[PDB]
Design a protein around this ligand. Structure first.
Ligand SMILES: Nc1ncnc2c1ncn2[C@@H]1O[C@H](COP(=O)(O)O)[C@@H](OP(=O)(O)O)[C@H]1O
Length: 263
């Protein structure tokens, strides 16, 4: 307990993923709420053995300082798709409320590729073409790992072994892109937070091509790495990608009791 009365608290909510779902947008928008304290970086507690072995005292020490009635949140997108994670989250807090943000599974693949491609292009390293990952022996490459991260039903089933359905709120990442404020209202509702966030905290930035955030005189967009142009992909290949996900999408829809407007 600091002189100002603040203290580090374990998170009362965690944004677990998906990788490229819009996790940083969700983290920054939720942290507009005066009752929310966000960790600025991805903590990687549950998913890295070298962090997790340090235990809960180490986790707590990575949290922002907050006041007792505030909710602390952390985002690490690797959580969702790491098999050992939900069991570790459950032994910290079986009752925790979790945030999962999902985009269209094909758009998420192209986003994931784009990000690693861009990490390479600036370090002046080579990177294969997306067709090199996506196509093997004239067929869609089902062993491309990005595709597995988009099989949401598989990862969701692993969380549902430990957490009840009603304690994982699914943010529609496609809708957050188009019109964030209604999705953010649902998050406040899920977390039982007063409606402090306003439509006026968001504005469309034409250069960015995405909404940016407005809060008591300060204007901020997400950084360079967020909202990057995906590669051009032949329509025939884009179509096969879309088709690949149709059946796993239906399995996901049946598991969570709702549908999403995906390709
Ligand atoms: N206001 C916003 N600004 C920038 N990106 C946003 C955004 N709202 C949602 N996003 C999505 O956040 C994605 C990145 O997700 P994460 O933060 O989990 O890595 C971006 O992927 P793209 O770069 O493919 O557009 C973008 O589509």
């Amino acid at each position: 307990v600091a002189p100002n009365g603040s203290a580090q608290q374990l998170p009362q909510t965690i944004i677990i993923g998906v990788r490229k779902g819009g996790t940083r947008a969700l983290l920054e928008m939720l942290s507009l709420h005066p009752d929310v304290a966000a960790a600025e970086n991805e903590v990687h507690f549950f998913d890295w053995e070298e962090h997790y072995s340090h235990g809960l005292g180490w986790y707590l020490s990575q949290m922002p300082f907050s006041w007792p009635h505030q909710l602390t949140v952390e985002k690490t997108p690797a959580y969702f798709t790491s098999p050992k994670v939900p069991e570790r989250v459950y032994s910290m807090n079986p009752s925790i409320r979790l945030l999962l943000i999902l985009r269209d599974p094909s758009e998420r693949v192209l986003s994931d590729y784009t990000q690693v491609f861009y990490n390479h292009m600036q370090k002046h390293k080579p990177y294969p073409s997306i067709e090199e990952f996506l196509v093997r022996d004239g067929r869609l490459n089902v062993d491309y790992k990005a595709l597995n991260r988009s099989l949401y039903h598989v990862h969701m089933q692993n969380w549902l072994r430990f957490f009840p359905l009603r304690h994982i709120h699914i943010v529609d990442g496609d809708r957050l892109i188009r019109d964030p404020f209604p999705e953010i209202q649902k998050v406040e509702r899920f977390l039982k937070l007063s409606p402090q966030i306003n439509a006026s905290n968001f504005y469309f930035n034409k250069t960015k091509g995405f909404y940016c955030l407005r809060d008591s005189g300060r204007d901020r967009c997400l950084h360079e790495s967020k909202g990057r142009a995906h590669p051009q992909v032949d329509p025939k290949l884009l179509n096969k990608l879309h088709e690949y996900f149709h059946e796993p999408n239906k399995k996901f829809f049946e598991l969570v009791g709702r549908t999403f407007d995906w390709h």
